[PDB]
Amino acid sequence: ELDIEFINSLLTIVWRFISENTFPNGFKNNVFYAPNVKNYSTTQEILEFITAAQVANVELTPSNIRSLCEVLVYDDKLEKVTHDCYRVTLESILQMNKALEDEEEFSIFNYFKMFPASKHDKEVVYF
C-alpha cells in the first residue's frame, strides 16, 4: 500500500516457512531424499498460514501473495516447481554467515576485503 517498509519483514517468515517443507533445517550445519517426499508447499497452504500467523494489515488476501513470492523467485530465494508451486533453493540456505573451494563465484557472501593495496580489480574501471 504505497510501500510501507514493514513488508520487508513479512516475506522473510513466508520464506522461512516455505523452507520448512523441504527438509528439517537442523541438517544445514545434510540429509536429503528422493523425489517421493513433497519438499514443496503450494501457495494455497501458506495463504492460510499467513492468516494463522496473522498480521494486523487490512487484506491478508490471496491472488497477490502468489505474486508476493514472485519477488522471491526474482531474488532467487526460492524456485518455482509443478507450474503453480514454489520451493526454496539450496543457495539461499547459505545465509548463516573446512577447506574452502577454489573460487566458486556463487559464494558472494563470504569473500573478504583488503586494506588498500594496488593490485585490485573493480568492475567499473573499464568506464
Add this chain to the structure above:
Amino acid sequence: ISSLEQRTLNPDLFLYKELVKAHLGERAASVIGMLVALGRLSVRELVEKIDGMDVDSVKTTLVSLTQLRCVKYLQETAISGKKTTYYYYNEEGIHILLYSGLIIDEIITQMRVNDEEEHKQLVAEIVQNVISLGSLTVEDYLSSVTSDSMKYTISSLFVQLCEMGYLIQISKLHYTPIEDLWQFLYEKHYKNIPRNSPLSDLKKRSQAKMNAKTDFAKIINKPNELSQILTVDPKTSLRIVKPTVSLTINLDRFMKGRRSKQLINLAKTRVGSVTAQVYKIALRLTEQKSPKIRDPLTQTGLLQDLEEAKSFQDEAELVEEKTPGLTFNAIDLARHLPAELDLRPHSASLINSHLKILASSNFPFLNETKPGVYYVPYSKLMPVLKSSVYEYVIASTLGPSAMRLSRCIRDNKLVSEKIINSTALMKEKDIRSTLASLIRYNSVEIQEVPRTADRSASRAVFLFRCKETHSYNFMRQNLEWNMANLLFKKEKLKQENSTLLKKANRDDVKGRENELLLPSELNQLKMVNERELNVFARLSRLLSLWEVFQM
C-alpha cells in the same frame, strides 16, 4: 595515478600484447600487436608497419611464434604465381599462455586416479616443456633423461595420458585458419562438377555445401583419431607413442574439461551436496567423447541464411544424447565411483535415487531418454549456465537488489517502470536508482515509444528489454580488460624492481639465508613476490569467470 591510458585500449589487443610481452620479449609483442591491429599480414607488409626492425629480425620472431602456436599462417599464392605467406594470429596459441598454470594443475589432478606416486611432480614436468617448446617429439625429451627406470616410466605415461586425450600431434590444420581452410575445402566440391551440369545454381551451391560439411568434420577429427598411438609392442609394452610425430597439446579437450569444472560448481548451490559428487564422476566418465565448447563449423561463415543455424542446432542436440559414449546409465557409475562416498556400501538403485533428483531441478542438469539412461544436455544448459553466473556478478557488485530487476526484466521482457514496482517491492526512488546504475552496463536496453511524430522524449514512456548477447559481450570484455590490466601492473612492478630481482638472482644463487645483503629489502622483496603471486591468484579467479562467456 589512475590508469586511464589503458582504459582506451582494445581489450583483446591489450590482452594479446601482454601475454607475449611478459613471456616472450618486447619484439614478439610488436609483431603480434600489428597482427591483431591489422588482420592478415605478409612479411613485406610487417617491415613497413613496424619501422624499427628489418626484414630478418622479424623472421627471427616469426619462426619462434609459430613454435609456440601463436601464429596461424597460410601459404597461398595469387593467380600470377607468387607464393606469399599471410601470417595471422590465433587465440588458442595465446590462451595456452593464459591458462598455463591451470593446465598443469589440471593434468596433475586428473592423473591422481591412475597411480598413487610422485607423478604429480613428474607428469607436471613433462607438460611444462610441451608448452614452453610448443611442438616436440618424444625421443628428444627421452634423449635428456638417462635412467631407464624413469625413461620407461615417462614413456609409459606419455601414451597413457595421450590415450585419454590432452595431447595430439601437430598438423597444418593447427596452423591454418578455419574459415580459409573451409572455403578451399568448399571449392573442392564445386569444381568437381561435370562441366555444364544441368543442376540449378542453388542446388549447385548446396551440392558443394553438404558434401563439404561432413568433409570438414572429417578433417578436424583426423588428429582426434588415435593413429599416433599406433606403436604396438616392438619388444614389450603393448602400446607406446609414435616417435616420429611432433606431439603438441590441444586446448579443446582442456576447455571441455574446464567447462565440466564449471558445471559441478553450479550444482553445488542448487541440488544437494553429496549428490553433486555423484554428478562429478558422472560427467567425468562421459568427458572425452563430449562435443566441443564451440563448433568450428560456426566460424566458417555459414550464417548468412537462417536455416544453417537450424542445421547447426540439429547436430548440436544430436550429439548430446545420440553418441555411444555420451549415453550412460546408473549402472556404469559404480565402476568408476571410488571408495569413501558414504551414501548410507554403494548400490546402483540408490544411485538412480540421486540421479532422479538431477532431473527435477529447474536447471537441466540430467534429463533422460530411458528411465535408467541419463544424459547431460549441452545446447540447453550452456545457454543457462552463463545466465546464472551473470546474475550473481551483478548481485555481488551492484548489490542484491540489482539482481532482482535483472531477472524481473528478463521474464517480462518488455516491462515498464509502472510494472516494475508492481512486480518488485522497493521504494520507487530506490528502483529508479538501481535501475539507473544498471543501464550504464548493457544488462538492459531501453525501448522508447514515439508518441509524437519525431522520437521526442518529452511525452513518451520507455520500455526495458534484456538482450542476452549485448549484456554478455560487454561482460566478456570487461573481464578481459581487467584480466589484461592485472598483468600490466604485474609486469610494471617487476620491471621497476629489476635491480632488486637482478640482485635476487645473481648474488644469492644459493646463499639466501642472509641474501648476502641487508634485511631492509628482503622484507621489501617479500612484499614484491607476495604481490607477484597474489596477482596470479586474482588471475585464475578471474579466468574462471571469463571462460564462461567463451562457450
